[PDB]
């Protein structure tokens, strides 16, 4: 990564490398893995990001999908940002192409040059944006259950049902507030008979906090 | 977080992330998780605080409730602090890290005078977690009664653990609740505690009821 004592490159840490590998092994592509990836890749160069992705041993379907998404974003970058270099200026590198941001056609030293300019070109953050773009798609594709199939069990506590409901909503939607309303209708309709009576009796406008307290004796 | 070298930004540590993730996995929303959260989030920017909350995989019911509480506090901030045209004064959504950049967050925290948007946001998050701790309290303080064979110490441990969660604080309005401790004690110890009189310390109560449990 690039760190402050002036901005310098520092080796990717053994703790960081292991932490990422293990989170992937244990949580796979559960939605929370993505915030963990972004945090573990703080300050990463494109080279560092590629190291993190390549150290994953399994899940090669997901990583192949990720490669395709990266290639799509790289192509869109080049379409919107051609590089006219020719003679590069005295204090400054070349202009980054899509493949340079992804660390495929750029050297580590080139990556550091862009990232450490006083006009900085944040090639690490751009690539991280593309990688997360790919990972989000994988989390949605690999979501095991549709939100329509989350129904409260006969003996399931409302809290456990609500946990399942919003956990599923998080992976399949990848849009926390895009469709919240219709799904707040579904939460009541798909609850089990006992909770449904309590939730219906609460009247209109009950908060989630209020619903969960009211429905604690159920289950 | 923001740390002392001059005040500089530092990436959230891998150790810290795991510590927070694991404490949530192991303790859920037991009341002691909050002092741990505030300490693990020492010096945090709003970005860092959001990262910690987002790395929680489970408990999505609680996390949605937390989002609701944050939105309420953000709205109250805007009502109490309007903003006119280095960026200008923070709005609620900027404090929560939703509409502000990391650089903007660092700018506010290091200004003279400092705008401690991380600490303000941390206050709101704790405000939400307290509500969650209260909601996930499994038992009411009214239902903590000393068992027939339960040692007084074990009953008192159960009593104040629950009292801590239902209050979401270790101590609040506890005088009348020290009356309840005696009334909910078992018959043998209750008689001993009543004879102890007003103003008895817990230490004194535990000594009086020693050996009685058996």
């Amino acid at each position, epitope marked *: 990564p690039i760190v402050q004592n002036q901005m310098v490159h520092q080796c990717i840490s053994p703790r960081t490398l292991n932490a990422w590998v293990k989170v992937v092994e244990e949580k796979a592509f559960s939605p929370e893995v993505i915030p963990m990836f972004s945090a573990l890749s703080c300050g990463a160069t494109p080279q560092d990001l590629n190291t993190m992705l390549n150290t994953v041993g399994g899940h090669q379907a997901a990583m192949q999908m990720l490669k395709e998404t990266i290639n799509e974003e790289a192509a869109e970058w080049d379409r919107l940002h051609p590089v006219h270099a020719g003679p590069i200026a005295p204090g400054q590198m070349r202009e980054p192409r899509g493949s340079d941001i992804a660390g495929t056609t750029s050297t580590l030293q080139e990556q550091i040059g862009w990232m450490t300019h006083n006009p900085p070109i944040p090639v690490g953050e751009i690539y991280k944006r593309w990688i997360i773009l790919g990972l989000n798609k994988i989390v949605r594709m690999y979501s095991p259950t549709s939100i329509l199939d989350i129904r409260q069990g006969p003996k399931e506590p409302f809290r456990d049902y609500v946990d399942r409901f919003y956990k599923t909503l998080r992976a399949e939607q990848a849009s926390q507030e895009v469709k919240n309303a219709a799904t707040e209708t579904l939460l009541v309709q798909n609850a089990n008979p*006992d909770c449904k*009576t*309590i939730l219906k*009796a*609460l*009247g*209109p*406008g*009950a908060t989630l*906090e*209020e619903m969960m*307290t*009211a*429905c*604690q*004796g*159920v289950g | 977080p923001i740390v002392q070298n001059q005040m500089v930004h530092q990436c959230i540590s891998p150790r810290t992330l795991n510590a927070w993730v694991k404490v949530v996995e192991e303790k859920a929303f037991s009341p002691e998780v909050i002092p741990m959260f505030s300490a693990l989030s020492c010096g945090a920017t709003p970005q860092d605080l959001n990262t910690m909350l987002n790395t929680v995989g489970g408990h999505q019911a609680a996390m949605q409730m937390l989002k609701e509480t944050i939105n309420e506090e953000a709205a109250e901030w805007d009502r109490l602090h309007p903003v006119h045209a280095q960026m200008r004064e923070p709005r609620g959504s900027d404090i929560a890290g939703t509409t502000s950049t990391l650089q903007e967050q660092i700018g506010w925290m290091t200004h003279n005078p400092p705008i401690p948007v991380g600490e303000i946001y941390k206050r709101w998050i704790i405000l939400g977690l307290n509500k969650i701790v*209260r909601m996930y309290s499994p038992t*009411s303080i*009214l239902d903590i009664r000393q068992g027939p064979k339960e040692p007084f110490r074990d009953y008192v441990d159960r009593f104040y653990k629950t009292l801590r969660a239902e209050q979401a604080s270790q101590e609040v309005k506890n005088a009348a609740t020290e009356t309840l401790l005696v009334q909910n004690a078992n018959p043998d110890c209750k008689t001993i505690l009543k004879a102890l009189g007003p103003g008895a310390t817990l230490e004194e109560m535990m000594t009086a009821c020693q050996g009685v449990g058996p």
Partner: nanobody
Amino acid sequence: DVQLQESGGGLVQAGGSLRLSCAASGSISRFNAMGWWRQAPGKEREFVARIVKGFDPVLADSVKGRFTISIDSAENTLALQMNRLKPEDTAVYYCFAALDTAYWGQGTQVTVSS
């Protein structure tokens, strides 16, 4: 296991006052939510008031300025105080308790006229 019974309803004048009370078996502090609904024959059941444990009381918009819902834990009773009664207030009023199902009373008749 838990039984509810309303009382306090009757015939009062418009602009009058009335206090309904709902008696509960066991201890009332054990319920996780209580509230009030009303129905007049041919009108759909209407929500009146709600109290969820630990929360402030919520009241319907058609009643907000005039009614109060309270809990008397000493007597184990749930009170709904009605003031400034209107033609819209004629109905049978039911209290609910929540706990594990939920539980309903049989209702009390309230008839408002001048």
